[PDB]
Short mmCIF file of all heavy atoms in Angstrom, two decimals:
data_model
loop_
_atom_site.label_atom_id
_atom_site.label_comp_id
_atom_site.label_asym_id
_atom_site.label_seq_id
_atom_site.Cartn_x
_atom_site.Cartn_y
_atom_site.Cartn_z
N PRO A 90 94.66 38.70 75.47
CA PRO A 90 94.26 38.46 76.82
C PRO A 90 94.55 36.96 77.16
O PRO A 90 94.16 36.02 76.51
CB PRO A 90 92.81 38.81 76.94
CG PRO A 90 92.21 38.46 75.56
CD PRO A 90 93.45 38.53 74.59
N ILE A 91 94.94 36.76 78.47
CA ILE A 91 95.13 35.43 78.96
C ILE A 91 93.81 34.81 79.27
O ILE A 91 93.08 35.23 79.97
CB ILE A 91 95.90 35.38 80.30
CG1 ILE A 91 97.27 36.14 80.08
CG2 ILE A 91 96.10 33.89 80.83
CD1 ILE A 91 98.17 35.63 78.96
N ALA A 92 93.51 33.79 78.42
CA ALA A 92 92.15 33.06 78.42
C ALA A 92 91.86 32.36 79.84
O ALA A 92 92.82 32.01 80.56
CB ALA A 92 92.01 32.02 77.43
N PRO A 93 90.75 32.33 80.30
CA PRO A 93 90.32 31.63 81.40
C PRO A 93 90.87 30.18 81.57
O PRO A 93 90.68 29.49 80.45
CB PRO A 93 88.81 31.67 81.51
CG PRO A 93 88.49 33.00 80.92
CD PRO A 93 89.58 33.34 79.91
N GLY A 94 91.38 29.76 82.51
CA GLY A 94 92.02 28.43 82.81
C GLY A 94 93.48 28.32 82.30
O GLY A 94 93.89 27.19 82.16
N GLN A 95 94.19 29.43 82.22
CA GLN A 95 95.53 29.56 81.83
C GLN A 95 96.33 30.44 82.59
O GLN A 95 95.77 31.10 83.50
CB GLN A 95 95.68 29.97 80.30
CG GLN A 95 95.33 28.86 79.31
CD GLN A 95 96.39 27.86 78.88
OE1 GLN A 95 97.63 27.97 79.35
NE2 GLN A 95 96.03 26.85 78.10
N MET A 96 97.67 30.67 82.40
CA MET A 96 98.39 31.64 82.99
C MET A 96 99.55 32.24 81.94
O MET A 96 99.76 31.52 81.08
CB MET A 96 99.26 31.08 84.18
CG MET A 96 100.17 29.83 83.88
SD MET A 96 100.77 29.06 85.29
CE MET A 96 99.40 28.13 86.01
N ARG A 97 99.80 33.46 82.06
CA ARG A 97 100.62 34.26 81.14
C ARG A 97 101.92 33.65 81.00
O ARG A 97 102.34 32.92 82.01
CB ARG A 97 100.82 35.62 81.49
CG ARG A 97 101.62 35.93 82.78
CD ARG A 97 101.26 37.21 83.43
NE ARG A 97 102.10 37.49 84.68
CZ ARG A 97 103.12 38.32 84.63
NH1 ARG A 97 103.61 39.01 83.58
NH2 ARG A 97 103.80 38.51 85.79
N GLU A 98 102.59 33.69 79.86
CA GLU A 98 104.07 33.23 79.75
C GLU A 98 104.97 34.36 80.34
O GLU A 98 104.70 35.51 80.16
CB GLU A 98 104.39 32.99 78.28
CG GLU A 98 103.91 31.62 77.85
CD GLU A 98 104.79 30.39 78.43
OE1 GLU A 98 106.07 30.43 78.32
OE2 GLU A 98 104.26 29.53 79.10
N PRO A 99 106.01 33.94 81.08
CA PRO A 99 106.80 34.81 81.84
C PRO A 99 107.88 35.62 81.03
O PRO A 99 108.55 35.10 80.00
CB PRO A 99 107.59 33.93 82.90
CG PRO A 99 107.65 32.53 82.21
CD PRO A 99 106.53 32.40 81.17
N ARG A 100 108.18 36.87 81.40
CA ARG A 100 109.22 37.66 80.90
C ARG A 100 110.50 37.42 81.70
O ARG A 100 110.34 36.60 82.74
CB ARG A 100 108.86 39.19 81.08
CG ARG A 100 107.46 39.65 80.45
CD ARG A 100 107.32 39.11 79.05
NE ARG A 100 108.41 39.63 78.20
CZ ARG A 100 109.09 38.97 77.17
NH1 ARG A 100 108.81 37.66 76.96
NH2 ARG A 100 110.03 39.58 76.51
N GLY A 101 111.50 37.98 81.33
CA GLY A 101 112.71 37.98 82.12
C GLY A 101 112.61 38.45 83.48
O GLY A 101 113.06 37.87 84.43
N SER A 102 111.98 39.70 83.67
CA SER A 102 111.72 40.27 84.98
C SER A 102 110.88 39.48 85.85
O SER A 102 110.82 39.52 87.01
CB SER A 102 111.29 41.77 84.82
OG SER A 102 110.04 41.88 84.27
N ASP A 103 109.89 38.83 85.26
CA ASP A 103 108.99 37.79 86.06
C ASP A 103 109.75 36.64 86.68
O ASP A 103 109.50 36.39 87.84
CB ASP A 103 107.90 37.32 85.16
CG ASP A 103 107.02 38.33 84.48
OD1 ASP A 103 106.74 39.41 85.10
OD2 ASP A 103 106.60 38.18 83.31
N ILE A 104 110.67 36.15 85.92
CA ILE A 104 111.67 35.09 86.45
C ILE A 104 112.50 35.60 87.51
O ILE A 104 112.86 35.00 88.40
CB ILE A 104 112.45 34.54 85.23
CG1 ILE A 104 111.49 33.71 84.31
CG2 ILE A 104 113.75 33.76 85.59
CD1 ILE A 104 112.17 33.15 83.03
N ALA A 105 112.98 36.94 87.36
CA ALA A 105 113.80 37.47 88.43
C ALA A 105 113.03 38.09 89.64
O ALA A 105 113.64 38.84 90.42
CB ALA A 105 114.69 38.62 87.78
N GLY A 106 111.61 37.74 89.76
CA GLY A 106 110.86 37.98 90.90
C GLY A 106 110.49 39.48 91.07
O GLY A 106 109.81 39.78 91.98
N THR A 107 110.87 40.36 90.15
CA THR A 107 110.82 41.76 90.32
C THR A 107 109.46 42.31 89.81
O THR A 107 109.02 43.43 90.19
CB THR A 107 111.96 42.34 89.54
OG1 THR A 107 112.14 41.72 88.23
CG2 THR A 107 113.29 42.28 90.34
N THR A 108 108.80 41.48 88.90
CA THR A 108 107.63 41.87 88.30
C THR A 108 106.55 40.75 88.32
O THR A 108 105.83 40.57 87.29
CB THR A 108 107.79 42.43 86.86
OG1 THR A 108 108.42 41.44 86.15
CG2 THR A 108 108.71 43.58 86.95
N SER A 109 106.55 39.95 89.28
CA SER A 109 105.76 38.92 89.44
C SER A 109 105.31 38.69 90.94
O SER A 109 106.01 39.15 91.87
CB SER A 109 106.26 37.52 88.92
OG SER A 109 107.46 37.17 89.48
N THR A 110 104.15 38.14 91.14
CA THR A 110 103.66 37.75 92.63
C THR A 110 104.12 36.47 92.97
O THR A 110 104.53 35.71 92.12
CB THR A 110 102.12 37.89 92.68
OG1 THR A 110 101.54 36.76 91.90
CG2 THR A 110 101.51 39.23 92.20
N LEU A 111 104.06 36.25 94.28
CA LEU A 111 104.26 34.93 94.80
C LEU A 111 103.41 33.88 94.14
O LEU A 111 103.78 32.70 93.85
CB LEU A 111 104.21 34.82 96.30
CG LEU A 111 104.57 33.56 97.09
CD1 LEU A 111 105.87 33.01 96.67
CD2 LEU A 111 104.40 33.93 98.61
N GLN A 112 102.00 34.17 93.94
CA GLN A 112 101.06 33.29 93.27
C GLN A 112 101.40 32.80 91.80
O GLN A 112 101.33 31.69 91.56
CB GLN A 112 99.61 33.99 93.21
CG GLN A 112 98.76 33.74 94.50
CD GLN A 112 99.44 34.30 95.64
OE1 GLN A 112 100.33 35.22 95.68
NE2 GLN A 112 99.06 33.77 96.96
N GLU A 113 101.91 33.81 91.11
CA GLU A 113 102.31 33.53 89.69
C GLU A 113 103.58 32.65 89.68
O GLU A 113 103.58 31.61 88.87
CB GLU A 113 102.61 34.78 88.92
CG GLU A 113 101.25 35.64 88.67
CD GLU A 113 101.61 37.10 88.23
OE1 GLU A 113 102.38 37.80 88.98
OE2 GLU A 113 100.91 37.62 87.27
N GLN A 114 104.49 32.95 90.56
CA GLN A 114 105.68 31.99 90.69
C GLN A 114 105.16 30.62 91.27
O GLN A 114 105.73 29.68 90.64
CB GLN A 114 106.73 32.58 91.82
CG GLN A 114 107.34 33.89 91.31
CD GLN A 114 107.81 34.85 92.35
OE1 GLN A 114 108.44 34.38 93.26
NE2 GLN A 114 107.42 36.11 92.34
N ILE A 115 104.36 30.60 92.16
CA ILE A 115 103.64 29.27 92.60
C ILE A 115 102.89 28.69 91.49
O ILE A 115 102.79 27.41 91.32
CB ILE A 115 102.74 29.55 93.84
CG1 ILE A 115 103.53 29.77 95.03
CG2 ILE A 115 101.84 28.30 94.18
CD1 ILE A 115 102.82 30.54 96.16
N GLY A 116 102.23 29.46 90.61
CA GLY A 116 101.58 29.10 89.49
C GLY A 116 102.43 28.37 88.41
O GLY A 116 101.95 27.18 87.97
N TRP A 117 103.48 28.91 88.01
CA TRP A 117 104.40 28.40 87.01
C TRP A 117 105.11 27.10 87.45
O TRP A 117 105.27 26.21 86.67
CB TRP A 117 105.43 29.48 86.68
CG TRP A 117 105.00 30.50 85.76
CD1 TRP A 117 104.15 30.50 84.75
CD2 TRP A 117 105.12 31.98 86.04
NE1 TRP A 117 103.93 31.61 84.20
CE2 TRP A 117 104.53 32.74 85.04
CE3 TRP A 117 105.85 32.66 87.02
CZ2 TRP A 117 104.41 34.04 84.91
CZ3 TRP A 117 105.76 34.10 86.92
CH2 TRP A 117 105.13 34.74 85.96
N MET A 118 105.43 27.15 88.74
CA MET A 118 106.25 25.97 89.31
C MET A 118 105.45 24.65 89.43
O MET A 118 106.04 23.65 89.04
CB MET A 118 106.86 26.46 90.66
CG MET A 118 108.08 27.39 90.46
SD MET A 118 108.79 28.07 92.03
CE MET A 118 109.78 26.71 92.53
N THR A 119 104.16 24.68 89.84
CA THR A 119 103.44 23.50 89.93
C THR A 119 102.49 23.13 88.71
O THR A 119 102.08 21.91 88.69
CB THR A 119 102.34 23.61 91.21
OG1 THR A 119 101.65 24.83 91.19
CG2 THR A 119 103.20 23.54 92.63
N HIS A 120 102.34 24.04 87.74
CA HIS A 120 101.51 23.81 86.64
C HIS A 120 102.13 22.64 85.81
O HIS A 120 103.24 22.32 85.95
CB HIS A 120 101.40 25.16 85.74
CG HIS A 120 100.49 24.98 84.62
ND1 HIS A 120 100.97 24.98 83.24
CD2 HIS A 120 99.14 24.85 84.47
CE1 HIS A 120 99.98 24.75 82.41
NE2 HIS A 120 98.92 24.82 83.16
N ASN A 121 101.13 21.99 85.01
CA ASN A 121 101.66 20.96 84.03
C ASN A 121 101.47 21.45 82.51
O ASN A 121 100.31 21.48 82.09
CB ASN A 121 100.68 19.71 84.24
CG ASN A 121 101.13 18.53 83.33
OD1 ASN A 121 102.40 18.24 83.17
ND2 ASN A 121 100.09 17.87 82.70
N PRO A 122 102.64 21.54 81.87
CA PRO A 122 104.02 21.31 82.33
C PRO A 122 104.34 22.54 83.24
O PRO A 122 103.92 23.66 83.19
CB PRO A 122 104.83 21.30 81.06
CG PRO A 122 104.05 22.28 80.09
CD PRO A 122 102.68 22.16 80.51
N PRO A 123 105.39 22.35 84.10
CA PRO A 123 105.88 23.50 84.95
C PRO A 123 106.94 24.23 84.22
O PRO A 123 107.76 23.69 83.40
CB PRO A 123 106.63 22.74 86.14
CG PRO A 123 106.96 21.36 85.55
CD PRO A 123 106.12 21.01 84.41
N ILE A 124 106.80 25.58 84.29
CA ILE A 124 107.90 26.43 83.90
C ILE A 124 108.68 26.71 85.18
O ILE A 124 108.21 27.50 86.09
CB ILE A 124 107.36 27.83 83.29
CG1 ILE A 124 106.62 27.72 82.12
CG2 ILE A 124 108.56 28.85 83.21
CD1 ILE A 124 105.05 27.57 82.22
N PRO A 125 109.91 26.16 85.37
CA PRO A 125 110.65 26.10 86.49
C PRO A 125 111.28 27.41 86.88
O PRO A 125 112.73 27.50 86.88
CB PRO A 125 111.57 24.96 86.51
CG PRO A 125 111.87 24.91 84.98
CD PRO A 125 110.62 25.36 84.35
#
């Protein structure tokens, strides 16, 4: 389970927008370090 204070690591389909929300995309992009 994704521990409190973190975010899941992305799959291929999460990166292609097909199985991720706008929030998760917003999450990865601004987080330190960012997954762009």
Side-chain angles (χ1 to χ4, degrees):
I91 302 308
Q95 285 277 355
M96 57 190 77
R97 70 207 185 96
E98 275 292 304
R100 308 311 300 140
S102 66
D103 302 323
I104 290 174
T107 42
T108 61
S109 57
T110 65
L111 186 51
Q112 274 60 24
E113 293 165 310
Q114 293 157 50
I115 290 160
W117 288 310
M118 288 175 77
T119 51
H120 184 251
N121 180 44
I124 296 95

